[PDB]
Every structure is written in C-alpha cells, then in structure tokens.
C-alpha cells in the first residue's frame, strides 16, 4: 500500500510541473495579453485623429485644385 | 579526446538577447555553464576554466565549446537556453559521458 504510494504520490509532483509550467509557460504570453490589452485602446485613438486629420487633409484637398479654375 | 556539443536553430536567428546553455548533474537542480550575449562576450561557470570555449554565429546561429580534461563529475546532460520579450524558451537537452 506504500511502496507504490512511495512511488505514485511523488511522482504525481513532476507530473503537474511541465504541463503546468507550460500553463504559466503559456499565460507568460498572458502576461502581455492582460497587459497589451490596452493596445487597440490607443490605437483606437489615432483613427480617428488621423481620420479627423486628412478631413482637413481633404478639407484642404479643396483648397489644391480648386484654385486651379479660378486662377486660370 | 574530443566531444564537442552543436546548439542549432531553425527560427528567429541571432535577433536574440542573450542566450545561454545549462546541464544537470545526477539528483540536483539546473544551473549556467557557460553564455554569450548580444555583445558576445564570453563567460562561463568556474567549473570550466580554460576547459570550456564558448563562441557564436550570425548565420548559423550554434554556439560551439570544448568538452575534455575530463572529471568523473562531466557525466550529466547538456543543454541550452534563449529568451525573448518576458519569456525564457529551453532546449532539448542530451547527455554527457566522462571516461
């Protein structure tokens, strides 16, 4: 009843260890993922600043050729 | 005599940090040996002096070393190391005969 718990419950220890370390292995990519989660938050911000940008950008698109006709 | 242990690699070459090799003697832990850098500089673990020579490639990407001058403790298994961005990836790890 020992011998084998002598033998089966200590390697029961290891046996957790890869699979589990591969887990916090794994999770390391968590690490950045709960961290990085941010990312596509300030990402988010330059869409539409840039977006507002070339409005302008387009806005003054306007200022370029229409001045073409009239000058002309 | 002459051993001498090849440390290959098949993705992300030489755009690494640091990187290292470990071996475990019989009924104990890991540890160092011996590491190359970025800037390569070479250093290993006292046990080595003169005994190990580490070195790199750009293209290969296989530190190289010498294993002789041999000491009934050299019986274990050799391995290597990387890491990247806030995580450490190991090697396979093979093992070693003094005689």
């Known amino acids: 009843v020992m011998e084998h718990l002598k033998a089966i419950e200590p390697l029961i220890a290891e046996i957790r260890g890869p699979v589990s370390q591969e887990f916090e292995a794994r999770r390391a990519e968590h690490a950045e993922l709960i961290a990085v989660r941010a990312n596509l938050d300030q990402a988010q911000r330059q869409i539409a600043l840039i977006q507002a940008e070339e409005r302008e950008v387009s806005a003054r698109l306007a200022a370029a050729e229409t001045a073409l006709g009239e000058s002309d | 005599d002459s051993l001498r242990l090849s440390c290959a690699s098949s993705?992300?070459?030489?755009?690494?940090?640091?990187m290292r090799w470990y071996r475990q003697a019989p009924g104990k832990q890991r540890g160092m040996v011996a590491v190359?850098?970025?800037?390569?500089?070479?250093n290993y673990v006292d046990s080595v002096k003169g005994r190990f020579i580490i070195s790199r490639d750009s293209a290969k990407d296989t530190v190289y070393l010498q294993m002789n001058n041999l000491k009934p403790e050299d019986t274990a298994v050799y391995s290597c190391?990387?890491?990247?961005?806030?995580?450490?990836?190991w090697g396979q790890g093979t093992q070693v005969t003094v005689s």
């Open positions: 190359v850098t970025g800037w390569g500089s070479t």
């Open positions: 190391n990387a890491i990247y961005r806030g995580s450490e990836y």
């Open positions: 993705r992300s070459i030489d755009g690494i940090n640091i």
